[PDB]
Amino acid sequence: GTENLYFQSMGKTSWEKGSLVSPGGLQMLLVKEGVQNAKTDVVVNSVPLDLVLSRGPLSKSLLEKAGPELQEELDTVGQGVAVSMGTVLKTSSWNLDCRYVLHVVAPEWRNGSTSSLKIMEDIIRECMEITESLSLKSIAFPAIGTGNLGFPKNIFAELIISEVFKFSSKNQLKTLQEVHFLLHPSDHENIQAFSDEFARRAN
Numbered sequence: 279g280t281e282n283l284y285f286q287s288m289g290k291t292s293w294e295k296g297s298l299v300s301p302g303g304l305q306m307l308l309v310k311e312g313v314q315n316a317k318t319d320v321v322v323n324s325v326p327l328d329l330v331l332s333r334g335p336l337s338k339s340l341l342e343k344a345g346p347e348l349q350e351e352l353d354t355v356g357q358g359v360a361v362s363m364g365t366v367l368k369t370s371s372w373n374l375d376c377r378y379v380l381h382v383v384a385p386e387w388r389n390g391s392t393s394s395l396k397i398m399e400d401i402i403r404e405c406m407e408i409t410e411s412l413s414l415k416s417i418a419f420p421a422i423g424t425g426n427l428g429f430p431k432n433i434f435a436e437l438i439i440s441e442v443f444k445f446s447s448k449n450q451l452k453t454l455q456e457v458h459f460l461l462h463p464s465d466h467e468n469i470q471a472f473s474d475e476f477a478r479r480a481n
């Protein structure tokens with residue numbers, strides 16, 4: 279579709295549809311759209327420890343589109359469990375076009391803490407594992423961590439893309455076929471970072 283970005287080839291004289299396929303067959307797509315318009319089976323949201331969905335711009339976009347039930351169901355899920363760093367909570371999608379939202383408590387950059395890298399990578403891995411376990415086909419990651427949590431966008435781009443490759447190399451997948459990277463149309467920094475990394479991988 280028209281929301282599928284291209285990336286410029288490293289030689290600069292060509293442009294390629296924003297699509298990369300791992301050797302194992304897992305497809306990654308560069309998509310320019312609001313997370314609120316995602317149509318994958320799963321969409322990933324980053325949330326604080328207290329699970330309030332109206333504090334960050336990403337989550338707030340999801341809340342407004344989905345309706346107040348998203349906050350209500352999230353709070354329901356969180357009641358029985360001790361919510362901590364890295365926890366993933368699943369809800370239904372309400373007025374969103376996806377089937378499930380995976381709400382993740384993502385870490386602060388903390389000046390490039392190695393702890394934060396590891397935690398973010400493991401969140402990303404886990405969300406894909408969950409998606410496969412639910413027998414679902416596709417998952418959309420927006421650029422979680424790159425706003426209030428302060429992950430540099432170039433570093434986040436290579437982090438998530440490398441994790442998707444790694445996950446694909448280590449797993450035989452029965453249903454998970456697509457990972458979409460959802461970039462907000464005005465987030466020119468993320469669009470560049472993700473495009474640059476696709477160019478590198480393709481070369």
Ligand SMILES: Nc1ncnc2c1ncn2[C@@H]1O[C@H](COP(=O)(O)OP(=O)(O)OC[C@H]2O[C@H](O)[C@H](O)[C@@H]2O)[C@@H](O)[C@H]1O
Pocket residue numbers: 311312313314324325326327333334335336337339340384420421422423424425426427428460461462465468
């Ligand atoms: N509607 C959208 N669609 C797609 N991407 C978006 C959208 N809106 C913003 N972005 C991009 O979404 C990315 C992330 O922006 P943030 O919402 O700050 O999430 P964080 O993971 O950094 O952490 C902040 C939250 O977590 C902490 O617990 C705080 O309490 C907050 O609740 C940015 O690159 C935006 O450009």
